[PDB]
Amino acid sequence: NQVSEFISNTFLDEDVLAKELEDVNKWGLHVFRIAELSGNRPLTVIMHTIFQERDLLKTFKIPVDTLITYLMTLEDHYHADVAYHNNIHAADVVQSTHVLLSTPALEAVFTDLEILAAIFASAIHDVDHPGVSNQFLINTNSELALMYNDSSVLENHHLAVGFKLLQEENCDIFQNLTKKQRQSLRKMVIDIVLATDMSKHMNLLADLKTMVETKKVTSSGVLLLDNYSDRIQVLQNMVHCADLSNPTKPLQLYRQWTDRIMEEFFRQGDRERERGMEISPMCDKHNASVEKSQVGFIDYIVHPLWETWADLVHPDAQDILDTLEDNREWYQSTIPQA
Ligand SMILES: O=c1c2cccnc2n(-c2cccc([N+](=O)[O-])c2)c(=O)n1Cc1ccncc1
Ligand SMILES: [Ca+2]
Ligand SMILES: [Mg+2]
Ligand SMILES: [Zn+2]
Numbered sequence: 167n168q169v170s171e172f173i174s175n176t177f178l179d180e181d182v183l184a185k186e187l188e189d190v191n192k193w194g195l196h197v198f199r200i201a202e203l204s205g206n207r208p209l210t211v212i213m214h215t216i217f218q219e220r221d222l223l224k225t226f227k228i229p230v231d232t233l234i235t236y237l238m239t240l241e242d243h244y245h246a247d248v249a250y251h252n253n254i255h256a257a258d259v260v261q262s263t264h265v266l267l268s269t270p271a272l273e274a275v276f277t278d279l280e281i282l283a284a285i286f287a288s289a290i291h292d293v294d295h296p297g298v299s300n301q302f303l304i305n306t307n308s309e310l311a312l313m314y315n316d317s318s319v320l321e322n323h324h325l326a327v328g329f330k331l332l333q334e335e336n337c338d339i340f341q342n343l344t345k346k347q348r349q350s351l352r353k354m355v356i357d358i359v360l361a362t363d364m365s366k367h368m369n370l371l372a373d374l375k376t377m378v379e380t381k382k383v384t385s386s387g388v389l390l391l392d393n394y395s396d397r398i399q400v401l402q403n404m405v406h407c408a409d410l411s412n413p414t415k416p417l418q419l420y421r422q423w424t425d426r427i428m429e430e431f432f433r434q435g436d437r438e439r440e441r442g443m444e445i446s447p448m449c450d451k452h453n454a455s456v457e458k459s460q461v462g463f464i465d466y467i468v469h470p471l472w473e474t475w476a477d478l479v480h481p482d483a484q485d486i487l488d489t490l491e492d493n494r495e496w497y498q499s500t501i502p503q504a
Pocket of ligand 1: 168169172173176364409410411412413423424427428448459460462463464
C-alpha cells in the first residue's frame with residue numbers, strides 16, 4: 167500500500183587501496199572500503215582507475231593532472247551530509263556502468279566517445295543532490311523547481327553543475343576533443359542523466375523491452391545497434407540499471423545501501439513533519455515496513471528491469487540476476503510476523 171504508493175509516485179510519469187582497486191572489473195566491488203582507504207575519495211580513485219584501464223587519457227589526450235583536478239572538484243560537490251546521494255553512490259554507479267560496458271554481448275559495439283560519455287554521465291548524475299526528491303522540491307515551492315519548471319528538476323541541475331565544473335582552471339577534461347566530438351558527448355550525456363529521472367522508469371523499461379523484441383546479433387552473437395536512437399537507448403538503460411543495481415549486489419553491500427537510503431528518506435519526512443506537510447510514503451520513521459518495501463521494490467521495479475537487461479545481453483547478466491533473486495529471498499524471510 168505505502169509500498170504501492172511509493173512505487174506509483176516515484177517510478178511513473180596506498181598499497182591496500184591498490185589491491186582493492188584490482189577488483190574494479192568485478193560486480194560487487196567493496197566500494198565502502200575503497201572510500202575508507204582513499205580518505206573519502208572513492209569517485210576520484212575509481213574514476214582514475216577506469217580511465218587508465220580503458221586507456222581514455224591517451225585516446226582523448228587528457229592530462230592526468232586535469233583529470234584529477236576535475237574529479238576532486240566534482241567529488242567536492244557531492245554533499246558530505248547526505249546519507250545516500252553522495253560521492254560513494256556516484257563511485258558505485260560509475261563502476262557498475264564500467265562493468266556493464268565490458269559485457270561480452272556488447273563487445274566492440276560502442277565507440278570510445280560513447281564509453282567516455284556513459285562513464286562521465288554516471289560520475290556527475292547526482293552531483294549537488296540536496297538529499298530530497300523532485301516532488302519535495304516541487305511541493306515546497308523551491309527555487310530549483312521554479313527554475314526548471316517542475317521537470318526533471320534535480321537531473322537538469324546535476325547536469326548543469328557537472329558541466330559548469332569543467333570551466334574551472336585546469337578542469338577541462340574535454341579540452342582536446344574536437345568540436346564535433348564535444349557536441350556529440352554533450353548531447354549523449356544530457357540524454358543519459360535525464361534518463362536517471364526515476365519517474366521515467368516505465369518509459370525506459372518499455373523501450374528496453376522493444377530493443378529485446380527486435381534484437382539483432384552478429385554471427386558471433388554480439389549485439390547489433392546500427393542507429394543512434396538505439397545506442398543512446400541502450401546507454402540510458404545501462405546507466406539506469408547501474409543506478410538501480412543495489413539489490414543485485416552482494417547482500418552486505420545491499421544492506422548498507424538500504425540503510426542509507428531509508429535514513430535519507432526519514433530525513434526528508436522529518437522536514438515534511440516540521441512543515442506540517444503530509445509525510446511521503448517510506449519517509450515516516452515511525453511507520454516504515456522496510457523488509458516488505460524491498461520485496462515490492464524488487465518484484466515490481468528492479469527484477470523487471472534486470473530481467474529485460476539480462477535478456478538483452480544473454481547470458482552475461484545471469485549471476486547478477488541470481489544474486490538479486492537470492493537477495494529478494496532473504497528480505498522475504500525477514501518479513502516480520504504477528
Ligand atoms: O536505489 C534504490 C534503493 C536502493 C536500496 C534500497 N531501497 C531502495 N529504494 C526503495 C526504498 C524504500 C522503499 C522502496 N519501495 O519500493 O517501497 C524502494 C529505491 O527506491 N531506490 C531507487 C531510488 C533511489 C533514490 N530516490 C528514489 C528512488
Ligand atoms: Ca564494502
Ligand atoms: Mg538521481
Ligand atoms: Zn543515482
